[model samples]
Target: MEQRSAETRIVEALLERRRLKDTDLLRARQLQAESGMGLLALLGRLGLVSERDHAETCAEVLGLPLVDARQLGDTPPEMLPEVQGLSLRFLKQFHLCPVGERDGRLDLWIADPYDDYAIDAVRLATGLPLLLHVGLRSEIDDLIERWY
Candidate 1:
């Protein structure tokens, strides 16, 4: 079968997310069994869905509101103090997703450079809980290294 494009895969995944969350559990289970995995795994395998996208979709499907990272993308440099402290080399790129907020607590979806450890540290410094989309191990890492 021909591979689907990134946008197609993303839309399909998002639709599936909506179906699974809103539909019956037994029906969802049947669909997963037929497909060999659950919603997250299916989406994660797409290779086009970034950690940021996966987390956003998951949170949204689960009825959690999202605070889009794109909104904060252009924040004034001085306002993100911790980001300013990072070395330029490691500061590669960053994206954020808001998972949810409850009784004044806010959770985040984080994507960043460095290993998992470094990512976790940044989350800690920011005081926002994070959801990391360490998607299908083989596809995501292989594609990332090869593409750029």
Candidate 2:
């Protein structure tokens, strides 16, 4: 039997706690086998959950911080792409971008932090400990264009 991933458990908890519709659970399970994408990514792509909420749920479940664009207002000057330590191509591929540094670590942004390729590759490439933050797709897109 396959064990459910922590990401999957978080998705389920968010679905129930946030009152997101019961059928979404079925849809997530169906996609779980096919796409094998983590539930946070799956729900957002499938439109079962808003990207902002999905990202917040990620931070909530993972006990990380959330970098909400609405709250942050204009992009911090420190969010420059070149300083992010990862290529722009990699950022675009993952729907993510590094925004700044916190205490000696990089503050990277993403809609789905559970993505293996996005998180793993970044960890290897940067050679610095990462602080994963939940970010909205809309915000990420805007940030990518505004800053990248």
Candidate 3:
């Protein structure tokens, strides 16, 4: 029920943002259940919304920034000392990447804002103030390969 409700909020956000039409939402929800694909990804697969819009909608709903993982890859970054304790396995498991740090806080990009487990674990493990951003899964995976 929690998962369904969380996805409901994203669908509502999509409608509020005008990224998806009411008509599209009905069909998206139907296909989402039938296909067992995430609502946003299902919409993207059906060409109802762009992948960028998916990330933006989630970011807006979560009050997190939307980051382009590709842009951050222009200059390969080194793992920050603060994040050294977080192993490659953990980062891959969470599908998140720590791109950089600022003002004593680490800037982390994650694929799913709903994944509070990963977010909370990261906060506890790193023990650094965090600034969370929403990013595409593929982009984050690429970042992990490059940096980790």
| RMSD of candidate 1 to true structure, Å | 16.1
Q: Which ten residues in a row have the lowest lDDT in candidate 2?
A: 75-84
Candidate 2, residues 1-148, lDDT tens digits: the string is 7799988788878877886667876576445534546666666678899876777777888887788676554555553244546767667657787767776787788877767666876777777677877787788878887776
State each model's CA lDDT, in order.
0.43, 0.71, 0.75
lDDT of 3: 0.75
Candidate 3 residue runs with Cα over 4 Å from true position: 1-53, 74-80
Off by over 4 Å in 2: 1-39, 71-85
Please write out the lDDT profile of model 1 over residues 1-148, one tens digit for every residue: 8799996687568768784343465465435444524444455566667656665555455555444433333322222333323333322232332333443443433332223444664566556444443222333333333322
Candidate 2 global Cα RMSD: 11.7
Once fitted onto the true fold, the runs of candidate 1 whose alpha carbons sit more than 4 angstroms away are 1-53, 58-65, 73-77, 93-109, 112-116, 123-148
The number of the candidate with the highest TM-score is: 2
Compose the digit string of candidate 3's lDDT tens values, residues 83-137. Answer: 8677788787667888887768888888777766567878887898889889987
Shift of residue 124 alpha carbon in model 2, Å? 1.2
Better of 1 and 3 by TM-score: 3
Q: Which ten residues in a row have the lowest lDDT in candidate 1?
A: 71-80
User: What TM-score does structure 3 among the candidates reach?
Assistant: 0.61
